[PDB]
């Protein structure tokens, strides 16, 4: 859900309290999905935000 907040201009919990990008960003953003590797059958609880 919070992938479009990575782009500059947008606002949100992640975009303003954890990671903010400048309005003159001249780079690239790479995103992919990995559910089985990052989570076991019981779920992952070592991630903080």
């Amino acid at each position, epitope marked *: 859900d919070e*992938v*479009r907040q990575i782009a500059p*201009g*947008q606002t949100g919990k992640i975009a303003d309290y954890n990671y903010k990008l400048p309005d003159d960003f001249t780079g690239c953003v790479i995103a992919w*999905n990995s559910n089985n590797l990052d989570s076991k059958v019981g779920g992952n609880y070592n991630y903080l935000y």
Partner: antibody
Amino acid sequence: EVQLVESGGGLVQPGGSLRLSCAASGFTFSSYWMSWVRQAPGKGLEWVANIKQDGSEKYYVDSVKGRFTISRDNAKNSLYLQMNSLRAEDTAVYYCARGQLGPWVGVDYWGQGTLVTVSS
Amino acid sequence: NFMLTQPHSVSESPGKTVTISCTGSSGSIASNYVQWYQQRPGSAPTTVIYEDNQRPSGVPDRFSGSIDSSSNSASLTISGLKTEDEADYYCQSYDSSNWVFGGGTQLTVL
């Protein structure tokens, strides 16, 4: 200039097999992306398939999942498309699509295509 | 279930600036690149817009495009409205390992 020649249709068959081939020239075959696109006569465009520059990864739409297969070779610069268990919906005009960097930049390439009709 | 919604018959006007709107519903179309394609009825299609802001070599600069994120829609604008051949246009995006195409927007009377 890039020339794309397609000649794989011109006959009808219910639920059999048909092979389509697209011939390409004027560019390196083993460095870019290619795809396949079809459209119904009088209807809009829709996507069929895509293939990597070495044929390792191939993908399809859920409507043609289970059937369909695509193969390639860089020696003679050609594309192969095999269809099996065709239906009446498959009356479409097929263009061999060629990409530039990936599935994000765009298609930008469309051959003249071949008229394909199916009758039972 | 990503799709794109666009009208079927717009821009029926002589010689001024009009806009064509392409929007999606399942996800945000601003995450990935969206392009505009045109086809000549009875022959091969071409492309007017790639990379959501750029044009092919030889394509006139009359065409213009923009993206709005408030309504999550893609806007294609044509300025000259010349004697260009009748055609219909499509809207293409990319969700995950698949391609989605628009319904089509006929434009015959210029």
